Amino acid sequence: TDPRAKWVPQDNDIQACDYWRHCSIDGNICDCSGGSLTNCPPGTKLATASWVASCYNPTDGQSYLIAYRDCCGYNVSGRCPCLNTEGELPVYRPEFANDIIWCFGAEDDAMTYHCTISPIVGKASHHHHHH
Amino acid sequence: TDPRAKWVPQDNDIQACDYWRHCSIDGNICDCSGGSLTNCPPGTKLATASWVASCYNPTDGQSYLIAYRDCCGYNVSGRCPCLNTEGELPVYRPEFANDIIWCFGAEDDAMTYHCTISPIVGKAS
Amino acid sequence: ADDALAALGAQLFVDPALSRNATQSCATCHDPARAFTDPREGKAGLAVSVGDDGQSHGDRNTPTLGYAALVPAFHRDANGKYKGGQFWDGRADDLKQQAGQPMLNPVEMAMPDRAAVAARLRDDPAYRTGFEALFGKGVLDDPERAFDAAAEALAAYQATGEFSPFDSKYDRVMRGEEKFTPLEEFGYTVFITFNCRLCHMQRKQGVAERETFTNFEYHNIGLPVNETAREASGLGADHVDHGLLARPGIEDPAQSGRFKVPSLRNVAVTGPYMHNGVFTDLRTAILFYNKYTSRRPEAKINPETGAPWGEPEVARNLSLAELQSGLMLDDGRVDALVAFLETLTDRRYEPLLEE
Amino acid sequence: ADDALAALGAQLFVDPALSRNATQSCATCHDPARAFTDPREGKAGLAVSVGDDGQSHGDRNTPTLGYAALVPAFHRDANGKYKGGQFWDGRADDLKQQAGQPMLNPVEMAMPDRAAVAARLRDDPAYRTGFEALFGKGVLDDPERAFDAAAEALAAYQATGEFSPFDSKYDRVMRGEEKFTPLEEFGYTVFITFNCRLCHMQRKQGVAERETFTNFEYHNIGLPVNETAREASGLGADHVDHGLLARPGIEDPAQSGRFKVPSLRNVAVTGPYMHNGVFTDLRTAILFYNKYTSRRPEAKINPETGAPWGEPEVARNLSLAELQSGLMLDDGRVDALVAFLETLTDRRYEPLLE
Amino acid sequence: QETQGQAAARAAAADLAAGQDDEPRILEAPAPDARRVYVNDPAHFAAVTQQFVIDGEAGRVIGMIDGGFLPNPVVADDGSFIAHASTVFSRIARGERTDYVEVFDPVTLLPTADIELPDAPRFLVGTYPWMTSLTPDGKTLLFYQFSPAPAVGVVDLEGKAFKRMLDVPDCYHIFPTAPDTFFMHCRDGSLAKVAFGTEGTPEITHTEVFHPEDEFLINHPAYSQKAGRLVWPTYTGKIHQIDLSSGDAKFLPAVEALTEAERADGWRPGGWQQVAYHRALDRIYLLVDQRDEWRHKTASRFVVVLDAKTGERLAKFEMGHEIDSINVSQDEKPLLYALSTGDKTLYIHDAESGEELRSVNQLGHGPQVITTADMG
Amino acid sequence: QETQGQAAARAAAADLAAGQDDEPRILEAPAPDARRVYVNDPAHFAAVTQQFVIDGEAGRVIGMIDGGFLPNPVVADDGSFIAHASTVFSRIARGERTDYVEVFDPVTLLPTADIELPDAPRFLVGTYPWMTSLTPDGKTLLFYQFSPAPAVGVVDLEGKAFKRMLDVPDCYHIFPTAPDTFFMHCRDGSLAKVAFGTEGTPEITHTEVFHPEDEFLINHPAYSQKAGRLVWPTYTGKIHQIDLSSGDAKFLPAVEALTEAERADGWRPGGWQQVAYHRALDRIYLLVDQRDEWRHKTASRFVVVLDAKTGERLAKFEMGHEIDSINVSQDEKPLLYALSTGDKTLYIHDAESGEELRSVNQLGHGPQVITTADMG
Numbered sequence A: 001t002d003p004r005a006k007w008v009p010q011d012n013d014i015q016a017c018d019y020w021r022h023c024s025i026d027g028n029i030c031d032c033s034g035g036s037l038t039n040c041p042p043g044t045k046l047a048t049a050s051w052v053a054s055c056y057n058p059t060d061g062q063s064y065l066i067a068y069r070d071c072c073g074y075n076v077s078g079r080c081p082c083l084n085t086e087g088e089l090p091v092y093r094p095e096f097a098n099d100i101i102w103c104f105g106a107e108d109d110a111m112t113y114h115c116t117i118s119p120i121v122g123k124a125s126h127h128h129h130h131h
Numbered sequence B: 001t002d003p004r005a006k007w008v009p010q011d012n013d014i015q016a017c018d019y020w021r022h023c024s025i026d027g028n029i030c031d032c033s034g035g036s037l038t039n040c041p042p043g044t045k046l047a048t049a050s051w052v053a054s055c056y057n058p059t060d061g062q063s064y065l066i067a068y069r070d071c072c073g074y075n076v077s078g079r080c081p082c083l084n085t086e087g088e089l090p091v092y093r094p095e096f097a098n099d100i101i102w103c104f105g106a107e108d109d110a111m112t113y114h115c116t117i118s119p120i121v122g123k124a125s
Numbered sequence C: 001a002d003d004a005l006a007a008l009g010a011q012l013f014v015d016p017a018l019s020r021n022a023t024q025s026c027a028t029c030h031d032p033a034r035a036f037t038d039p040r041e042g043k044a045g046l047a048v049s050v051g052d053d054g055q056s057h058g059d060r061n062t063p064t065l066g067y068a069a070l071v072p073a074f075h076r077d078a079n080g081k082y083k084g085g086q087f088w089d090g091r092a093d094d095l096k097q098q099a100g101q102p103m104l105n106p107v108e109m110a111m112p113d114r115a116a117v118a119a120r121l122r123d124d125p126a127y128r129t130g131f132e133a134l135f136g137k138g139v140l141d142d143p144e145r146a147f148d149a150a151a152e153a154l155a156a157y158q159a160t161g162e163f164s165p166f167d168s169k170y171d172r173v174m175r176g177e178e179k180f181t182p183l184e185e186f187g188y189t190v191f192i193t194f195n196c197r198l199c200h201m202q203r204k205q206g207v208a209e210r211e212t213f214t215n216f217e218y219h220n221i222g223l224p225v226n227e228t229a230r231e232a233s234g235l236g237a238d239h240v241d242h243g244l245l246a247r248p249g250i251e252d253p254a255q256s257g258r259f260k261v262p263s264l265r266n267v268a269v270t271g272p273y274m275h276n277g278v279f280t281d282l283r284t285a286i287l288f289y290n291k292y293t294s295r296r297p298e299a300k301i302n303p304e305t306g307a308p309w310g311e312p313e314v315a316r317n318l319s320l321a322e323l324q325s326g327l328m329l330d331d332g333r334v335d336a337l338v339a340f341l342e343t344l345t346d347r348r349y350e351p352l353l354e355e
Numbered sequence D: 001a002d003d004a005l006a007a008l009g010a011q012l013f014v015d016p017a018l019s020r021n022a023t024q025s026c027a028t029c030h031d032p033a034r035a036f037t038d039p040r041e042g043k044a045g046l047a048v049s050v051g052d053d054g055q056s057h058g059d060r061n062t063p064t065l066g067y068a069a070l071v072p073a074f075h076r077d078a079n080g081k082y083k084g085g086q087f088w089d090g091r092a093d094d095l096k097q098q099a100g101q102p103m104l105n106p107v108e109m110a111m112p113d114r115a116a117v118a119a120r121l122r123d124d125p126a127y128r129t130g131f132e133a134l135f136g137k138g139v140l141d142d143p144e145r146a147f148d149a150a151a152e153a154l155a156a157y158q159a160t161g162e163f164s165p166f167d168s169k170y171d172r173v174m175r176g177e178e179k180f181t182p183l184e185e186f187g188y189t190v191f192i193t194f195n196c197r198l199c200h201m202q203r204k205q206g207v208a209e210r211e212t213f214t215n216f217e218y219h220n221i222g223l224p225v226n227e228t229a230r231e232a233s234g235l236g237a238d239h240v241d242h243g244l245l246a247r248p249g250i251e252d253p254a255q256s257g258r259f260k261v262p263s264l265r266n267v268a269v270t271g272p273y274m275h276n277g278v279f280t281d282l283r284t285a286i287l288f289y290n291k292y293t294s295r296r297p298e299a300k301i302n303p304e305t306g307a308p309w310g311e312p313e314v315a316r317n318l319s320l321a322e323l324q325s326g327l328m329l330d331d332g333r334v335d336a337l338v339a340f341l342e343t344l345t346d347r348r349y350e351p352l353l354e
Numbered sequence E, F: 001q002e003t004q005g006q007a008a009a010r011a012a013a014a015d016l017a018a019g020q021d022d023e024p025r026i027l028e029a030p031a032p033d034a035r036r037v038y039v040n041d042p043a044h045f046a047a048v049t050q051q052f053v054i055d056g057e058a059g060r061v062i063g064m065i066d067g068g069f070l071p072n073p074v075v076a077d078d079g080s081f082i083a084h085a086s087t088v089f090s091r092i093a094r095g096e097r098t099d100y101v102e103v104f105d106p107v108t109l110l111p112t113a114d115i116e117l118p119d120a121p122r123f124l125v126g127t128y129p130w131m132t133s134l135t136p137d138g139k140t141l142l143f144y145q146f147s148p149a150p151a152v153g154v155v156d157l158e159g160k161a162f163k164r165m166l167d168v169p170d171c172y173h174i175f176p177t178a179p180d181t182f183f184m185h186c187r188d189g190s191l192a193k194v195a196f197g198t199e200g201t202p203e204i205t206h207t208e209v210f211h212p213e214d215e216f217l218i219n220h221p222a223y224s225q226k227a228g229r230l231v232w233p234t235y236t237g238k239i240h241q242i243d244l245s246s247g248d249a250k251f252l253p254a255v256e257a258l259t260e261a262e263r264a265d266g267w268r269p270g271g272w273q274q275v276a277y278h279r280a281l282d283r284i285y286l287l288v289d290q291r292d293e294w295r296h297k298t299a300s301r302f303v304v305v306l307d308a309k310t311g312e313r314l315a316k317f318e319m320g321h322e323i324d325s326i327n328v329s330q331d332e333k334p335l336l337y338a339l340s341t342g343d344k345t346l347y348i349h350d351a352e353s354g355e356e357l358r359s360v361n362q363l364g365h366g367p368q369v370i371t372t373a374d375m376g
């Protein structure tokens, strides 16, 4: 509830904006419009593009690589909106930037933002953003 | 504030939902998006259709016929939303029905609802 | 003074001696028993009136003089809309300017000149007394003065309560002295919610003190030629009634085909309808508006003839923005409008409603 | 036991007596000094290898054996996607089933039959002892048992930590022992954010215990024919390499032109690239992915030829959903990717980078 | 007790611990069932709008459907599809209007039909469920037109094509009773029965007038197509029941939702969907509260539940929120749905006890319409 | 103390008393002036959006413009017209994409040009004012494309046609300097100068690298076209100032928005449009607050004002609200516009004292971008 405060990750509720994997999410958690943590809601299109973040996992003390992905081709869900920016870089460093509608590669050239999934792709370990 | 209480008209603020002319308005007060009490905002289209209400004017103790008219061809303004239903009848008495998008006659076939104006057209009888 | 001038006008109004052959007075065509309209049959039914020579027909329907004194002098407002005046094309500025015209019109009263009108007035000792009392000694000796004074007398008489009594059921209802029938009240609500009020209400908004159901503007509603009236008048198959454009000093091609919005008071008793008397029935004038709104085939048909309304006399400058309201009048609403318009009948003419 | 079996495999791996003319061994083509690939120049350069007979050329690039033991046995998964196996076209189920095939392939080691293989094993007193200790007495007298035993020893040899040491810079960085250079980390990031990771990763999500930069699936990335290699192979100009569809039992036309996703470990030192060795440079292999994404006139052109890449040898079943990612790899990102890929080189092959 | 986002966090941590893999993909929504509920968000006349597909049992959003200007949603009772009649413009709210019908698969939510309606014929009005309607066989969509005259449009969903506009008398709403037949409520206080073909003037019959000019029948009557029951409240909570199951209108005994003392004390119905009908229970639910007579579109905090046969009151539920629209699931032990346009929240109640069980919030900007499928 | 709605009631009451008539019409917006301000609502990635035209003096909404998905607003510095690059889909958020430029008359708000952009070339991103840009002569509009690669679209507003895509290196944003020249910011830390004739490649020059790999520059630099001043804050409030008024990039001295102590105390810039630049006063305004290093997009409660020439702090305002974007009118005694995404309110401050004068609420769903015209 204090927006300026250092963000504190939890591992108890994926729908809340302080869930550990959402550390650099922008938009809406797919789990609130009929997707899940790591799947898209029906009728949307999963982008193949991602932006990536190292998110510290409070539970095991390990930092994980979250390759966020957009579900596209719907109007914005309006449910569970969240904006976090852990390690988020400006647009000229796009691989870490989250204002971008990362809908590239989606089926049917879907390019509207509905919501974002938060799957783990590895265990790193950045430089601009390490634990 | 009490939504269920009898509506109490005022004749001192045209942007509030208790302004006397808005007694059966449904939507947004045009004055809130660049129109006025009886004019459309720029870029919208004035409907020729209307619906009427007999609205009591607490300034002069007279009831007046208010022939509402929609400003059309814009997404809903989202400012000064209001909904009143003094003498509002179901849809089968469309003369007095206000869920209807009364944009008929608007230039360029504009049929989207933006806001509503509240002109008097006569005394109530 | 005010009453005397009116009283002189009353004499002149019924006096056939203002016509060449002395058969015709204002009251002849503007018959006080029929809301100041012409009950006589001509070659074109009741559509057009027959002049003093007993052969000559005009090209326009003779309008009521009821409430005509409520029309403002002809003018253009800041809107660039022309408003007011007298005659269907508003070519006379006002009542006084209008009065002299039927007098000297060869197709109407047909007096050769102003000198000949004066001469007739000079022959009557009641006029010498009446005119001189109001305008001074020797007024009847001067053709211009005598002619102008008559026009003024005639204007003043038309400004009396006699002509605009505001004692219709509508008026009674608006004073709270009675109530509309269910049909009349629906009629009224329709009139104010559908496009009628865009033209047939004095004001754009607020409340009119003496409503006469016209905004005094000029609109081309896209009326056809009245074939029989046009034949009777003899203006020719190639003649176009240009309406307001025919007023001297109006050059604007956009004014072609536009006519003054008639007052709807006494409309139930002053058939036939429109500038050329083309429609017989009040219902028919109302149904005409559906041609611009309704999708159904019957909207294009004149129910009095079973044939299309026909091509507008002037296909340009139609008031389509107003006329194309996107909402058709069903028969329920048409019945409602008729009933409402009948309430606009002056008290003394309510007996005429029956027939 | 598994020790001894692998030690027997180690012997068999370098023994040219397993070829008809006794001129080549597994090691001739899968040279331990070149990340288990062929350094020998032939008619078609390093694109394809030369068999025991000294003239016969294969039609495919000789792949590394490093990490090949990490690939699952051939199977079709629940999404209906084929995964794993050995050879570029997955025609062998596992390392064991594969081993025997080069020994009896006339364009490679060219032994006529299993009998002739067993006969050469019988010549060596050390093989009688080695084999008999692991598989029992008279194993070498039975051609089937011998051949199978040899293949098994070879498979076990290939599963030793020696073929999969997991001691690349990448391995050490993921152990926290050291860090990626800025360019390497960018390469890594690019690799997992652009389309690469959709095919060159063990998993779709989570953390891979022993990552080998392949999902073991089959894709047609629409490569053209390698002219000289194809000419050298002698299979004909009519010939079409149908990839996976060539595996016996695969009948599905959607698999035509599909090839196993190679492990990218030691990719930097096992040029030339792809199933036909068509690209000499690693940078070219990367560049090739831009033809599906970039609209620049240079995306259509192979830098090694200065001419259009060429039509797909198999025009259909292209993985367009994955390849048409609507994102181009600029020069910087290709540089980054080259850097990252170099970190997948095993310790012992780090000298080979220059 | 544990929230869905909690359970999900727990499950996700267990998968990570156990090195479990899963392919990120497009979910299917769970099979439609009796406790699926659709909420439409006319968004207070916004040019684009949202429908939320909700599992009422879990109180979870299982999907969404995008729409244009004031769409009319419909839901096949058998569960096979949903569809809407919708309206878009080439430049957001201006330019070329396209009216169309979409049909959607209820598990993938993909459009399986996009049917253009020629000459922009949709009635644009605050959403009345019964201004667009599915015939019982699910093959025909009927939609009301107001301009230039009352009319009714026939959309063939099976052949995926617009059929025709039917001329109707001065009447409103469309309650289908058969593949070719529907009733409307007429200005003159009658119902009109309209039987139509592919071509030819429709057969239009009138029932007798069933109410005086001064009883005002609300815009959101409940209609159980399967029961043929039309439940039409008036401004006073007087309920007209018309039985259309014979194919013709039978007028059922009038019932009062509110008692005389209640009415004397200013109790009146109020809201949007003020009335719900449970078919198998033959129960009427009416949103009511103490209100002035011209506050008939405001929220209400109470639901009365009354036996439809007798008009006997079975319950008065204090809803505990500002409820505009009610509806019910049509299974046994039904859920009573109670949508607050103000809260943008669907409150899911046990219909027997009125107890609030769970709620689904963040449903758009001004959601107003609840639709359930009657599947059983 | 009389509000605009109250004065309006009094005037309306007086027209009624006096029997004054007036024609219901379409109002014209007041001529554009220095105090006119536009607020764009990207509506949190909603498929359709709104621009609010505001009279900053009266704090009155004088008109509105509808937009599509994440449109880029531009406003001709001289007041002759506004425009935007927008994006619509044939089915709300799905189907065929059309990217287009509209140009609007600033008093009728009527579109005077509608220009289709071929092959859906717009960069779709949370709104950055300098991803779409007017040339100083108002004749050309330049928009950024990111996919398949960085590129810049050239749109001829005079001829009302799209011209062509320009190749650029790995660079971002567009800052026009001439009818045929604009600078971009590149990944390698340099700026790319792009000069484009009528055909073939543009001529791309790079500047010296002017910041290191680890110094992060914000997505919303202030750029005054008439000054040629590019004002670029970093995540730490270090501000790069680049003069472009000679045609080439002179790098002004680097300056610090925050003190060494403040940065140690956790003071950082944060928000959306975190920086404003007044051209006549040669002054910089920066939205700052105490925050964690990775809370750079959260609202800020403070604005600091510094002389662009020296770097001296001129004032520090406690804004009294959660502000996300700021901008200034470009007249004398300018207003400081402070937009709260959260409140959806434009707070209108006196830029001298930092005092709140008036506010305009209900500006959409999540308004973010303020544009003004530099009419001086």
Ligand code: HEC
Pocket (backbone or CB within 6 Å): C013, C024, C025, C026, C027, C028, C029, C030, C049, C050, C051, C052, C058, C060, C061, C062, C063, C064, C065, C068, C085, C086, C087, C088, C089, C095, C098, C099, C100, C102, C103, C107, C108, C109, C154, C155
């Ligand atoms: C031949 C029959 C006839 C006679 C006699 C006649 N009128 Fe008319 N009146 C008409 C016709 C026909 C028109 C409409 C013609 C036109 O608009 O050009 C008309 C129009 C008018 C109008 C304008 C009304 C309006 O609403 O536009 C006035 C006023 C009028 N007459 C008054 C008089 C007076 C006063 C006299 C006696 C001096 C008189 N008329 C004599 C037939 C007659």
Ligand code: HEC
Pocket (backbone or CB within 6 Å): C194, C195, C196, C197, C198, C199, C200, C218, C219, C220, C221, C223, C258, C259, C260, C261, C262, C263, C267, C270, C272, C273, C274, C275, C276, C282, C285, C286, C289, C319, C322, C323, C337
């Ligand atoms: C666009 C302006 C306009 C609108 C809207 C309009 N009218 Fe008229 N009306 C006229 C004009 C002008 C005339 C005279 C036409 C002519 O004769 O050339 C007229 C003539 C009439 C007449 C014949 C009167 C006579 O004395 O000859 C009747 C009756 C009438 N209108 C009724 C209606 C009704 C009912 C409506 C609403 C459905 C309506 N009008 C809407 C302008 C309008």
Ligand code: HEC
Pocket (backbone or CB within 6 Å): D013, D024, D025, D026, D027, D028, D029, D030, D049, D050, D051, D052, D058, D060, D061, D062, D063, D064, D065, D068, D085, D086, D087, D088, D089, D095, D098, D099, D100, D102, D103, D107, D108, D109, D154
């Ligand atoms: C003449 C050169 C040559 C010799 C000798 C040779 N190979 Fe190969 N190896 C190849 C070629 C070429 C391929 C690819 C064949 C194909 O894809 O059809 C290959 C493929 C393989 C593979 C599959 C790797 C993968 O990623 O699919 C394994 C394992 C293998 N060889 C091991 C061996 C063993 C063990 C021996 C000794 C019995 C051996 N090879 C002899 C050249 C050779």
Ligand code: HEC
Pocket (backbone or CB within 6 Å): D191, D194, D195, D196, D197, D198, D199, D200, D218, D219, D220, D221, D223, D258, D259, D260, D261, D262, D263, D264, D267, D270, D272, D273, D274, D275, D276, D282, D285, D286, D289, D319, D322, D323, D329, D337
């Ligand atoms: C559609 C799945 C897919 C995608 C996406 C993909 N690859 Fe590949 N990659 C393959 C397959 C399959 C082959 C072998 C192709 C063949 O020879 O038929 C291959 C071959 C390679 C090779 C040659 C390796 C060798 O041993 O010969 C390199 C290097 C490579 N890929 C890197 C990349 C990079 C870097 C990216 C991201 C730009 C990428 N790939 C995208 C599947 C993919």
Ligand SMILES: [Ca+2]
Pocket (backbone or CB within 6 Å): C037, C061, C062, C063, C270, C271, C272, C273, C274, C277
């Ligand atoms: Ca007449």
Ligand SMILES: [Ca+2]
Pocket (backbone or CB within 6 Å): D037, D061, D062, D063, D270, D271, D272, D273, D274, D277
């Ligand atoms: Ca190779």
